[PDB]
Amino acid sequence: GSSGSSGECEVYDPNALYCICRQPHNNRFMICCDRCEEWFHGDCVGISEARGRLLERNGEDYICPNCTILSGPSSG
Numbered sequence: 001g002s003s004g005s006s007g008e009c010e011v012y013d014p015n016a017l018y019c020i021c022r023q024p025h026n027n028r029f030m031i032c033c034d035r036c037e038e039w040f041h042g043d044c045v046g047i048s049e050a051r052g053r054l055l056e057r058n059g060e061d062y063i064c065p066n067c068t069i070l071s072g073p074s075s076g
């Protein structure tokens with residue numbers, strides 16, 4: 001049977017999971033990874049509010065842990 005529900009969008013929706021902790025975007029600090037290109041919470045991924053803030057202004061490429069944890073740096 002025809003299935004599809006494309007209506008209003010919000011964070012409240014519990015079905016919306018981003019961070020690895022399976023939690024909605026809350027006040028918690030969030031950053032945009034480059035490896036997995038996913039949304040996570042600083043505290044969760046360790047990255048502190050400040051640690052990330054700089055990565056922006058400075059111009060550094062943040063790399064969540066869950067990513068590196070898998071494999072080391074480039075070049076195997």
Ligand SMILES: [Zn+2]
Pocket residue numbers: 019020021022023040041044
């Ligand atoms: Zn989280």
Ligand SMILES: [Zn+2]
Pocket residue numbers: 033034035036037038063064065066067
């Ligand atoms: Zn990542």
